[PDB]
Design an enzyme around this catalytic site. Structure first.
Site, PDB file in Angstrom:
ATOM      1  N   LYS C 175      22.910  -3.917 -19.301  1.00 47.04           N
ATOM      2  CA  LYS C 175      22.728  -2.523 -19.639  1.00 47.04           C
ATOM      3  C   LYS C 175      21.286  -2.163 -19.281  1.00 47.04           C
ATOM      4  O   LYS C 175      20.346  -2.535 -19.988  1.00 47.04           O
ATOM      5  CB  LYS C 175      23.112  -2.260 -21.102  1.00 47.04           C
ATOM      6  CG  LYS C 175      22.635  -0.919 -21.627  1.00 47.04           C
ATOM      7  CD  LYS C 175      23.137  -0.641 -23.050  1.00 47.04           C
ATOM      8  CE  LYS C 175      22.636   0.662 -23.576  1.00 47.04           C
ATOM      9  NZ  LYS C 175      22.827   0.612 -25.042  1.00 47.04           N
TER      10      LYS C 175
HETATM   11  C1  LIG Z   1      22.458   1.826 -25.825  1.00 47.50           C
HETATM   12  C2  LIG Z   1      21.998   3.193 -25.394  1.00 47.50           C
HETATM   13  C3  LIG Z   1      20.515   3.568 -25.823  1.00 47.50           C
HETATM   14  O1  LIG Z   1      19.606   2.388 -25.699  1.00 47.50           O
HETATM   15  C4  LIG Z   1      20.198   4.704 -25.035  1.00 47.50           C
HETATM   16  C5  LIG Z   1      19.257   4.639 -24.019  1.00 47.50           C
HETATM   17  C6  LIG Z   1      19.027   5.773 -23.216  1.00 47.50           C
HETATM   18  C7  LIG Z   1      19.696   6.979 -23.378  1.00 47.50           C
HETATM   19  C8  LIG Z   1      20.634   7.059 -24.393  1.00 47.50           C
HETATM   20  C9  LIG Z   1      20.884   5.927 -25.185  1.00 47.50           C
HETATM   21  O2  LIG Z   1      21.792   5.996 -26.171  1.00 47.50           O
HETATM   22  C10 LIG Z   1      22.720   1.711 -27.313  1.00 47.50           C
HETATM   23  O3  LIG Z   1      22.280   2.523 -28.087  1.00 47.50           O
HETATM   24  O4  LIG Z   1      23.419   0.776 -27.610  1.00 47.50           O
END
Ligand SMILES: *[C@@H](C[C@@H](O)c1ccccc1O)C(=O)O
Ligand SMILES: *[C@@H](C[C@@H](O)c1ccccc1O)C(=O)O
Ligand SMILES: *[C@@H](C[C@@H](O)c1ccccc1O)C(=O)O
Ligand SMILES: *[C@@H](C[C@@H](O)c1ccccc1O)C(=O)O
Ligand SMILES: O=Cc1ccccc1O
Ligand SMILES: O=Cc1ccccc1O
Ligand SMILES: O=Cc1ccccc1O
Ligand SMILES: O=Cc1ccccc1O
Lengths: 326, 326, 326, 327
Positions: C175
């Site tokens: 990710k």
């Molecule tokens: C993964 C997603 C977050 O780390 C994140 C990063 C950037 C934009 C939006 C989001 O939600 C998670 O929360 O597990």
């Protein structure tokens, strides 16, 4: 006649400000090697570079005297004799000084200024926007290249900043760093030619082949054939759809840069930007950048060695690609 | 003879550089209100201030032209006529410019320079140490006050730096920030008079009453009686062992400052250091600081309002303590 | 047999952990809405998602109890019934706890874990590398997705770290956040499927269309049609060379995201990642994310409004692209 | 025993490590706590005259112990102390429910309070942090709380307004505090809390406010507690006589002993290796056996370890010197 974004294509090389042997000493007063300046310019034109930038961080805009700066620019302008576009650099501690310097250097014959922001006090968004508007209002004939370096200038040049700069006709280009938000910044700022760093040109050119036609290079100061080959092969790739050779050159460049940054860290690099770039150039042997003006004349030895290794690597690429150019 | 640390005692007030009404406009020249400059000096001397500092961040060292600085320093020197020591400020982008400015302003008749470090490139320890050595070597008649502000100058002025500065005779004092490591810095640097900020003077004077006899004040630009009362009451407390009155003054001062920093953050204050200090002074009504020179002429309205409230609060202290003095 | 990188393609959607009405209360013990969990899974499958991730930051891996986690994963596994790959998340404060959780959740039937690093103490490169090697050694049949979030985990997941992870067979995907160094990371890590954020997929797929075949989505939780349309149109662009429709979708996504981050700032977003994502999902009305578990149950109102507006924008895209898929 | 008050917190409060068995760096190991070394350390600290015992912060490996290990460790400490000095466990965890669960159990076993930072996966803001501590105190009203105010570990920076809020919570009686730049103000904002400076800052802090600053925390005591005891005793005498020279000299010795502990003099770099450096220092001093670090924090660069070892030797030297001055 004022440069336009559409006129900015290909390889834009950032040249240092060559120094005399005594340049590290605060007692010295005329530390620009003006003949080495002229020699570098002619060599860059001869290599086929599209445009010349100068007087950013490693170019020692911060540490030259005003008489040094005027002599340097004078020599560059006399040598170029209008053959390629040329940007001086006039970043200073306040708006009025930037305006003063920009007027004088444009008058001598630069086409534009590569310009960061005053950085004693960290600027916010409206302050920075106002600052560039003020400079463009005061010196309407100057093109402006935004020098978007957050380490040096504190301000981080965010998305809404680009939207505002695209409204200023004098702002034609940007010396840009990481390309994580290039896709969006291109959309926000349709009137600006964004210059990625040479190592990122391959990726950026693939994102947006129509808009991303130019890049900035400091590796060229170790021998420009590499940057010339990159430019040429990317033009070809856009036409044929075959990106393999462009990728191979770009990967070579990244490897050549792999020892430049102390511990891989741009923030640690940024403390020694001047000494590391100039040492790398000295080591490559294509030009003589010379000692750093005070106060930035001390660099830890292991960092110097990384920079020198990088300079040798870029020199090796220059020799390889010189032959591929023929 | 050159000021010594031993001679630095009591309340050292940092004065702004008063602006004319057009000072925010990049087109303006001669933006220093020289008569307001003289009037402030005379008022500070009349209040009993020990020494005058100037040309730091909120004093607009960054945004004045050279002619403005020469006129300002000339007015101050003519006004003081040798009655209290006076430090100009000559922080600039490089060692040679600092030296140039320091020589001129000392020659006009300042006693010393309040000096940060060149900040386009972030300095490391050996670079910073060599910079101050260089200035001291170049201008041996100048006393130096280290302006130890990491937000402005990026360098964080660490423990080992203070040990090195203590070997330079010209380095007689420091404009110091947080006192978390003051105890150790005092041990490392026996030859420097460390000036805490006025609000920390109480605590610092209890830590080391022999060494901490002086503080710096910007709040005095809102009416100096508070700073004068603090000085006088600490002298008394050191003799009697009864710190109650000194504590109550010091606590009033912290309360007066409680709305100054945007959301209580030094980093956010630092983006608007000039505008907030000047706005607070304008609001207090003891002097007219005037508009901010470009580019730092834009401050969010919420932040301004906190500054104004602080200004009114310090004016109230000045009224209260003026009555206790006489 | 364990997933491989080659098996990771298309739209990979990160599900929240649906909460009961009382979930913000520390007294509550069974706060997972298991029927909403099942419903979300079947809806994602029906929409054609390629795989499901869970239990990152907004998925409240930090704030679920162990019984809740087991129940949640059990419900997902029994709903999926082997039809698409599923990753749980097992980030914890130490290696032993990560291993224990990973074994039990894989045993229940997850295919892999989406895993950050322990973050009480900031990890360095060799510590982070050893951590992932230890987990892969302890649980050889778990696939690992690197959760490369520097805000959450302090460690910044640098270039050399990716070179090391590519040597660990269990590490099949990442990710990933900003794509400034994706070109290089792909070269350093040939064995990893890097998942850019949905908004960055367009640019990343253009950089390297062979390697960048997959992305991660949280916008899909507001209606997955937009992500499915992006996926399908990028497949078509790669074949035809016409990127305009993919570009239009991607631009739409970025506009829908333009109000999510407080002040445009990832660091400020990161302080409220849970409450902002969940509020966005609640506002879109495609699923019921529900209250946030303690302590992260307080979000400033203006930030909430930004996230709700983003949810409405994403819902509008889902209705738009639902029609274009029908 | 009624709950500890701030007024009851005085003198030298020593932070104990969680002693580890030889195999403790291996993720395969369970029962990595050396419980006999744990008992021995406690009795040695009591014999030296320490006023209270803290545990289970950063270098105490609250992050890397298993729950069974924590229970055994706390059980051993409690049965060893047998009510003779107050004792804080540590229950910082990733969420409020887990903190509450652990705090109830460890208090029930017999700790008097918990040394508690904030959940740190997501960086807390001010109201979030305030509500966190309110929730814990509400859930476990019989636990005393020591605020572990470490911005490096916990991201939140424990600002001025936070201290004003904590002073309203009767359970919050003390704070493991770091730099003293805003101590004067924090004392005024938080009248109900005994602020514990680090041992090296105690001298300065006690002179700032001798009425309020009667206690400090010490990790240097894990290298030989005589130095901390002498500092305590000498500051008591200084407050009475007004002669601070002897107190000043001990403090200066302490700072010198600490001069090589932080990599490059940097708190942020020390913070990456807080566990391994503290434990290596203690191992080098030879007063106790802290033992290997539990995973993942089991790798420290050699140069940094060496600074830690030199510091341990210097603190052992201070213990020998001050042991003789104590008679
Ligand atoms: C993964 C997603 C977050 O780390 C994140 C990063 C950037 C934009 C939006 C989001 O939600 C998670 O929360 O597990
Ligand atoms: C611009 C070039 C630097 O800002 C820089 C940035 C990234 C890699 C290498 C270099 O030199 C300048 O110094 O003017
Ligand atoms: C010095 C004063 C500032 O650096 C400063 C620092 C802290 C509180 C208030 C002020 O103004 C200067 O601006 O010269
Ligand atoms: C508390 C002590 C650390 O946070 C710390 C801070 C400063 C100097 C030395 C040490 O250990 C703990 O680790 O529990
Ligand atoms: O981070 C530093 C940097 C410099 C040039 C290009 C891209 C980068 O990310
Ligand atoms: O943190 C900012 C600051 C400024 C002046 C004096 C003391 C301080 O702590
Ligand atoms: O760096 C932060 C970030 C967050 C979401 C998407 C792309 C990004 O670069
Ligand atoms: O900044 C680090 C630090 C650590 C312990 C005590 C005082 C300090 O300032």
């Amino acid at each position: 006649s004022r440069l336009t974004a559409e006129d900015i294509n290909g390889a834009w090389t950032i040249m240092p400000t060559p120094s005399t042997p005594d340049a590290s000493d605060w007692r010295s007063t005329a530390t620009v090697d003006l003949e080495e300046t002229a020699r570098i310019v002619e060599e860059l034109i001869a290599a086929g570079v599209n445009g010349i930038l100068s007087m950013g961080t490693f170019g020692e805009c911060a540490t030259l005297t005003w008489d040094e700066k005027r002599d340097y620019v004078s020599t560059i302008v006399e040598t170029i004799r209008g053959r390629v576009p040329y940007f001086c650099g006039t970043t200073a501690l306040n708006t009025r000084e930037v305006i003063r310097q920009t007027r004088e250097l444009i008058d001598i014959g630069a086409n534009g200024t590569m310009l960061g922001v005053p950085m004693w006090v960290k600027m916010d968004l409206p302050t920075a926007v106002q600052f560039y508007r003020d400079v463009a209002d005061a010196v309407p004939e100057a093109a402006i290249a935004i020098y978007a370096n957050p380490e040096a200038f504190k301000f981080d040049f965010p998305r809404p900043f680009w939207a505002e700069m695209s409204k200023i006709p004098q702002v034609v280009t940007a010396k840009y760093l990481g390309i994580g938000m290039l896709d969006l910044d291109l959309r926000l700022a349709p009137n600006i030619r964004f210059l990625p760093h040479e190592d990122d040109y391959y990726a950026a050119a693939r994102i947006n082949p129509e808009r991303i036609t130019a890049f900035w290079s400091s590796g060229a100061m170790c021998g420009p054939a590499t940057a010339i080959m990159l430019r040429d092969e990317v033009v070809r790739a856009k036409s044929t759809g075959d990106w393999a050779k462009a990728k191979a050159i770009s990967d070579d460049m990244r490897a050549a840069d792999s020892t430049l940054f102390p511990r891989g860290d741009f923030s640690e690099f940024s403390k020694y930007n001047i000494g590391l770039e100039k040492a790398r150039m000295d080591a490559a042997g294509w030009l003589k950048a010379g000692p750093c003006r005070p106060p930035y004349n001390l660099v830890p030895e292991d960092y110097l060695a990384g920079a020198q290794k990088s300079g040798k690597a870029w020199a090796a690429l220059h020799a390889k690609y010189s032959n591929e150019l023929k």
